[PDB]
Design a protein around this ligand. Sequence first.
Ligand SMILES: CC(=O)N[C@H]1[C@@H](OP(=O)(O)OP(=O)(O)OC[C@H]2O[C@@H](n3ccc(=O)[nH]c3=O)[C@H](O)[C@@H]2O)O[C@H](CO)[C@@H](O)[C@@H]1O
Length: 321
Amino acid sequence: SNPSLVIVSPALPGANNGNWRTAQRWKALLSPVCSARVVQQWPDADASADTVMLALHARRSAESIAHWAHAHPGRGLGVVLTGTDLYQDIGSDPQAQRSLQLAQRLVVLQALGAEALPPECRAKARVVYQSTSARAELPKSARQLRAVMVGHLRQVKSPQTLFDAARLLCGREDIRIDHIGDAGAGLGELARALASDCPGYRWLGALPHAQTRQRIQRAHVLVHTSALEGGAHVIMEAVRSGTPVLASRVPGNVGMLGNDYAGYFPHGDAAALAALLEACRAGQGSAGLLDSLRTQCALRAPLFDPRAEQAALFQLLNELQ
Ligand SMILES: CC(=O)N[C@H]1[C@@H](OP(=O)(O)OP(=O)(O)OC[C@H]2O[C@@H](n3ccc(=O)[nH]c3=O)[C@H](O)[C@@H]2O)O[C@H](CO)[C@@H](O)[C@@H]1O
């Protein structure tokens, strides 16, 4: 008999964020070989038919992870390290550390993620790069540089780095920056004030996923400053659109873009990001940095094909059964 998979995701049904997107897409991808359902907590009324658990975020789903582990000791449990659990919580949070213990498998969303796990947990760690649909790569104009950052405003995304970079460039009309993401910490008020002082910066608020991918595809560069990432959706969405990236040098980003990528800046170093934006703009009048990055990003694009994520999921599913 086919397994009955239950995905635990802390996102609210229908929400437009990474946690919901992973869960829905994993459900669609595993449905050829198993019955799949997504819940916010476990157990529930239908819990006794479940045979495999895939739980997102070792701390936020901790109580559901522990209920499963106590209900099925030694069998069927995979814990997915979404970012903040892995680069924050497992250093000191007791529940985060418990879920690492109890899991049969540990899923990290890029290659560098197991490095951040304790050594006794690496043997059961598994990499599942995420996937996304492609968009055709558009030729873009050389007359100005348009940059986009996408992420609901949370401190973990370090929007202050984009804020400060925008200011360093307050006086350049040939460089434009659009910021997509809900207000989400008072960072909204900081974006409105920036937008008023520097007309080259625009905070678009939250945008539905289709329009967001369109703007990623239309922009010259995606910018991503996060202090930590499990493996950000927005970066593969750019890569699979032919839109290169500039990103903070953090393991979550470096696992996605490559160890040798030429588009990193030290995290929170706003000046280093402004200079990358300047070098990208300078290269349009002349191969410049933009095309180097694009060449490097085209080499990363196959990592985010849906057939490859499903194959990784299939094998993980066998191992939990
Ligand atoms: C740890 C961290 O810092 N982020 C993690 C978080 O995703 P998190 O939600 O933080 O950020 P992601 O980039 O991964 O996902 C955001 C998704 O929402 C969409 N979007 C966002 C704002 C908006 O206004 N309009 C819109 O459509 C983006 O295109 C993207 O598809 O959990 C994911 C796994 O579930 C991980 O892959 C992320 O690395």
